[PDB]
Ligand binder design. Sequence first.
Ligand SMILES: [Zn+2]
Ligand SMILES: [Zn+2]
Lengths: 354, 354
Amino acid sequence: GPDVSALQLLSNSFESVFDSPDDFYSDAKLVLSDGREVSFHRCVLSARSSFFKSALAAAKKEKDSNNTAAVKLELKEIAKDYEVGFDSVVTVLAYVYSSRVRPPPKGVSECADENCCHVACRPAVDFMLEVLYLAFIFKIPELITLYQRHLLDVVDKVVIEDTLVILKLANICGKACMKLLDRCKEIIVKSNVDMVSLEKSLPEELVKEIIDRRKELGLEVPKVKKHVSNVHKALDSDDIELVKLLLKEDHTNLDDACALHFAVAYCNVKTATDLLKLDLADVNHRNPRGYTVLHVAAMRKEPQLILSLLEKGASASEATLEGRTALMIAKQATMAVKHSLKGRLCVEILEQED
Amino acid sequence: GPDVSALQLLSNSFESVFDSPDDFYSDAKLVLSDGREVSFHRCVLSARSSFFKSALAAAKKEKDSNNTAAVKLELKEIAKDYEVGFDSVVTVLAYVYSSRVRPPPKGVSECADENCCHVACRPAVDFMLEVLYLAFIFKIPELITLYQRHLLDVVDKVVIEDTLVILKLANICGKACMKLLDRCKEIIVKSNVDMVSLEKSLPEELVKEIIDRRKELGLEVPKVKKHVSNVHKALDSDDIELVKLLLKEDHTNLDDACALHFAVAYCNVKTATDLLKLDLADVNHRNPRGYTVLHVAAMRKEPQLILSLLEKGASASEATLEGRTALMIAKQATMAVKHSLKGRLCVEILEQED
Ligand SMILES: [Zn+2]
Ligand SMILES: [Zn+2]
């Protein structure tokens, strides 16, 4: 194959261009969220995508460099509608340069557990989400096809509370992720995620689109019981004595509104702290989905809450329907490794009290 | 073929880079002999060849452009051991950029005859020689192999007068072209070309071996004939008094040394002008190769000398030992193309004599 070998040679040459970019007359820089800069050459990213073409063309004249300065592209000020890391950026640029995908570095898409195969857990998933969003915004259709195929293949195993973020990002995209959007939507619909849970962490248009679908399979679950909406809307807006007086006013089973789980998962740490300082609601009374208070406390990655609820005597050895305790929730939430030390501190507490 | 398709897309993108260099932020220009400029981006040619990387690293500080102009590379100062046109440079740059070779524009690898088959005439060989030299000096091994194989399988069909320049360039190139050098050298040695031509059109460190190729593969060819050497060295020195005095003393036959052939081939138009008027020897006599004076005159690109010969009555109806008249020499020796018109001035002069 004389034809293919020359193509291989071109690909290797440009891969060597990317690997050592300082030496080969690199011009521009992409500046990330935290502040890392990745060097690149205007020619190749101008040619390989329309988006960078428009961006560089626009940014040319508005400034003069006199060969003593580059042009900087702020990924925080361009890809506005989501947040991305560093290794995904490296992967996308490496695909642009060398026409092949680069496997992620060690200890990134692997979480903490002993025998978590690292296929569906949180780090692998959100790595895929970051690279898919970057490819969508940068207009590379084939990379869209590949990574959308990956997510669509894995989507069955993942837990619902991450299928939600998958759905959110899929809606962030356009028609490019139509298959993923529809599959994920029909996954969520047949489940039993409560009204408030969808309303809090999904756009209004989409929650309408799903709540008028709930009653279409013949599955009659309307939105009722506006009584607890007062407590929820009164405690999400950071007021405590108000809800104390309200609960003491009508005497309408505070715990039965799952105020503990709601405040632990969606409210702020101070609010949950004072709510647990008050002692008028049970702690092991699990919510309709099947999560106790400390399950979601661990999933939120807040060590102060975990230790405080350990002080309340809540049984930290009771598993959900799937069978996962606080230890394994905390393990599969985190990323194995100037980083986020929250996750690695909660795992320790649940291996201690024995 | 997923893997092949990505490489194909990369190649097409970079070809689209090359085709329109102004839009994709070019940074340097090659400049040819006549003064034509070809735009190129320092990244790709820095990566694809060591020689360009060295040249650019040398030129990176002499002139600080500060976005006032680009850095222009003078080809003569770069590869000064041979001459190169334009379409060959375009072809080599296109191969480097897009990993495939672009055929020359219609009319450059073709002669002016409409009966030739256009596989071994003069421009066809000239194009290949130019591209082979450029590939050798740019250090592009596979292009070397391809064009070397082209010339290698063609060499055994081209008239010896072009085999001489083929060998000259092959000796210019190093051991990269050994399979061409030995082949062409053997073809030359086995022939009956006279020794004076070899002495007059090659370096000495090569003829010193061409002598032994005949003195060792069996034959005893070398003559002496120092007597005519004085006539030769007098005539080639743009003199007439010396040759007249030397030929008026010994009264040696001018037709033995074939002086008209020497004057037409390796002498200026002045000696031809002051010797052809001097009518003392036959015009229709041929050297051991088998060419008349008119044949070499046609091959020389000297229309004025050809009209001078036609004044003196040289028969154009007689054919060489290769079976060719003067018309077809004149036609096949030019190309079918705002340039040096003088090639197509000769063909008419010799044509209408019907
Ligand atoms: Zn895992
Ligand atoms: Zn021809």
